[PDB]
Amino acid sequence: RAQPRAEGPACVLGIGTAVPPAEFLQSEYPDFFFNITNCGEKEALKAKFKRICDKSGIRKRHMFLTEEVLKANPGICTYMEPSLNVRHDIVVVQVPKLAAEAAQKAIKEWGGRKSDITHIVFATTSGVNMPGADHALAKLLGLKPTVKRVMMYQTGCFGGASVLRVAKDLAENNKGARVLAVASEVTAVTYRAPSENHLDGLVGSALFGDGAGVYVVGSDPKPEVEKPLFEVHWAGETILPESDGAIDGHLTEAGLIFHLMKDVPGLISKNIEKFLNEARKPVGSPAWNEMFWAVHPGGPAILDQVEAKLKLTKDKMQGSRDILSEFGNMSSASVLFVLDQIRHRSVKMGASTLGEGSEFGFFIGFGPGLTLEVLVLRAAPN
Amino acid sequence: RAQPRAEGPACVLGIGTAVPPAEFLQSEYPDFFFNITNCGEKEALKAKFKRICDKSGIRKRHMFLTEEVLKANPGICTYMEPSLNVRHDIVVVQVPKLAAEAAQKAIKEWGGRKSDITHIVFATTSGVNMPGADHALAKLLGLKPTVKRVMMYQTGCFGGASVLRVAKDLAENNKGARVLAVASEVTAVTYRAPSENHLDGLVGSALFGDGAGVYVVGSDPKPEVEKPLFEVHWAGETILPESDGAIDGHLTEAGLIFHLMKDVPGLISKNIEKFLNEARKPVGSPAWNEMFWAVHPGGPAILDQVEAKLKLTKDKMQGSRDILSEFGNMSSASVLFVLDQIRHRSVKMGASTLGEGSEFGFFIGFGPGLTLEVLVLRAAPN
């Protein structure tokens, strides 16, 4: 073994959640969104967006698009117009910068020197660049020349789960590796004008928000210096049956489009239980009401049907709803923010653990093809 | 440790190299390529491409962009025209299918049942899709539903090295995992008409070829059933000091563009030794001239200056030149093809090892930002 490996499970030694300073209220978001894209006269589709938005358990959204950014880059405000260049410039400058702010927060919470960073796992559903957002983050923080970078471009809404799994494997295979598990998401390539022909786009626009979640992932933290917040224990996927084009994401010239070929909320909601009913076996299979739910907030249909089909307490899935209301669906970063909010609720309410008292939890991510990216985490004591 | 833990270095249990049936001789490639894109009318640019081609050490190349494909799919024949959509429609089927035939060859050489596949690491600097080329490959071979897929998009010319490193960490962390290390590269999004402004485009067109390399990567091979060909021993990456926009890959609406700011062959060639000197230590320095060279064939400038600076025998770096002549530069798949050709040369002349007698070798990959993806391999005997 030329390169020594770790001897412990991957742990989250620091959570850094960075959002753009601009904030939007979902009470006023439909009007602003139908005004800024100059598509506010579609009264019936406007009312449909209203119904989705107030159905969506969303109150606030953080985006870098603001207003000055949106007018400075008008190509995003259009629908089905080739604009990947300007969106790509936006994500190239900002996704590394949002990731760097989140990484500075996660480092200050982590305490370790930036020179101790050796790995960067980076999932972005927004933009692509061969010079690298991972390399841009490595330069911005000035970690080290010897920085191994794994860049998982175009990961779906399970991108946060995929980053957690890949960073877990990276940290558990390299001794002393300090993986910067980054899931920075800036909804500039997915942002689009509302179109009735694409209702999944309407669901995304009512749900998608910007957010940078950075985890300092590593094994065997230094005692009294590095503290662990969550211990990743399991990771797996499953292409659930009847998953044929349910969610289809094509990064066209117009950006990233979640083309509507199926009822995404209903299909994902009815298919969630399948892999969940078996993914909890290695833990010891505790009660379903003895586990917190770091579920990706993919829309209130998912939470409602998961609650109905597993008969969970209303407070069990409250952290996902809280992140949905405060930030929305931030794609890969959404589930990382859900975990951070679960820890915040635990410390605010004085919970026994960082998972609102539950020793284990589901780091659920779902995306195109109904891959059920599921990680089981152990919350650190509070 | 809920998910069991592997033991032993990642090994290449089967090499599957699939190329499309079409062939294009580099002796006749410049005329064909300047005719198909309606660019054969020029004189100076045409002569410059001629000089680059006959200095490129290339004889023939395999491309899925045949006559029929190129005519039936225009837009790829143009320069600076938005065409990522139909290039994407090409590579969402052909990259998975080329990977599938390469994986069938790698499985037949591997012998193990397809249902034993659990992981898919996939590098493709050619195209992007959220449903997933990894998922498409998983369906095409009919693997298990519990297939964990790591998809690294737009890695670059070091994509094969990145796949080797990531699949090494995946196979060395999951017990019994059979990672399909895929580096399928169909030069459809990077195919471009010649242009005077993009002089790096000339180098790419003269060098870029289409090919798929699939490695069945896993730890603990089954004796008398699974045979290992190469075992990965090291993996690293540094940003060399003079790396500032030398290679810049922007996947714009027109596809993947390698914009030039500095002399790429000269800079890469002058900078390789910087990390090559230190990447040797883990091995123990058998001898600078006692190591085979699975170098990515990024152009004869790189081979010439590396040979001159490190004082290498002519036969030491012959496999990379052979792959350059027979297939060109296939980005991520190029290094995998170089390793396969090194094995073929070793078995053809009866070499002691699968690395022309050398116990160790350099799996060299370089890309944008002058990241030097270096892996030290150990060739199997005979």
Domain ranges across chain A: 11-218, 230-379
Nearest by CB to A172, which of B83, B173, B248? B173
A205, β-bridge pairs: none
Q: How far is B368 from chain A (nearest CA, A)?
A: 5
Taking an 8 Å cut-off on Cβ atoms, the answer to whether A235 and B3 are in contact is yes
Task: For an interface test with B, give the residue of A78, A150, A162, A173 to mutate (most B CBs within 10 A).
Answer: A173
Instruction: Please list, in sequence order, all residues whose beta carbon lies within 8 angstroms of the beta carbon of residue A332, skipping any fewer than 6 positions away.
Output: A123, A124, A125, A155, A157, A158, A159, A160, A162, A163, A183, A184, A185, A213, A365
**A–B CB contacts, 8 A cutoff, strictly below:** 178
Cα B51 to Cα B272: distance, rounded to the nearest angstrom = 25
Nearest by CB to B234, which of A3, A149, A155? A3
Residues of B in contact with A3 (CB under 8 A): 233-235, 282
Residues of B in contact with A162 (CB under 8 A): 150
Q: How far is B214 from chain A (nearest CA, A)?
A: 19
Place of tokens 């081979």: B303
Cα B286 to Cα B143: distance, rounded to the nearest angstrom = 41
Tokens representing residue B354 in the block: 């699968």
Cα B92 to Cα B315: distance, rounded to the nearest angstrom = 39
> B288: number of CA atoms within 13 Å, CB side?
12
Cα A143 to Cα A126: distance, rounded to the nearest angstrom = 24
Q: How far is B43 from chain A (nearest CA, A)?
A: 32
Strands B360-366 and B372-379: antiparallel
Which CATH superfamily, name and number, covers B230-379?
Thiolase/Chalcone synthase (3.40.47.10)
Taking an 8 Å cut-off on Cβ atoms, the answer to whether B247 and A162 are in contact is no
Q: Which of helix, strand or coil describes residue A250?
A: strand
Which residues of A are known catalytic residues?
Answer: 157
Q: Which of B132, B136, B127 is nearest to B154 (CA)?
A: B127
| CB contact at 8 A, B96 and B64 | no
Taking an 8 Å cut-off on Cβ atoms, the answer to whether A239 and B149 are in contact is no
| CB contact at 8 A, B250 and B156 | no
Taking an 8 Å cut-off on Cβ atoms, the answer to whether B146 and A247 are in contact is no
Task: For an interface test with B, give the residue of A122, A150, A179, A253 to mutate (most B CBs within 10 A).
Answer: A253
CATH 3.40.47.10 applies to domain A11-218: yes
Cα B159 to Cα B367: distance, rounded to the nearest angstrom = 8
**What's the burial of B313, exposed, middle or buried (CB within 10 Å: 0-12/13-18/19+)?**
exposed
Cα B189 to Cα B191: distance, rounded to the nearest angstrom = 6
Nearest CA in chain B to A164: B150
Cα A355 to Cα A22: distance, rounded to the nearest angstrom = 29
Nearest by CB to A236, which of B82, B85, B148? B148
Instruction: Specify the resolution in Å.
Output: 2.2
- Expressed in percent and rounded to 5, the helix, strand and coil fractions of chain B are 40, 20, 40
Cα A265 to Cα B167: distance, rounded to the nearest angstrom = 33
Q: Which of A247, A283, A308 is nearest to A358 (CA)?
A: A283
Cα A135 to Cα A150: distance, rounded to the nearest angstrom = 10
Q: How far is B348 from chain A (nearest CA, A)?
A: 31
CA separation, residue B348 to residues B229, B316, B325, B340, B344 (Å) = 15, 16, 18, 12, 6
Taking an 8 Å cut-off on Cβ atoms, the answer to whether B235 and A3 are in contact is yes
**Helix residue ranges, H only, A150-212:** 159-171, 199-207
Cα B210 to Cα B22: distance, rounded to the nearest angstrom = 10
Nearest by CB to A148, which of B84, B237, B253? B237
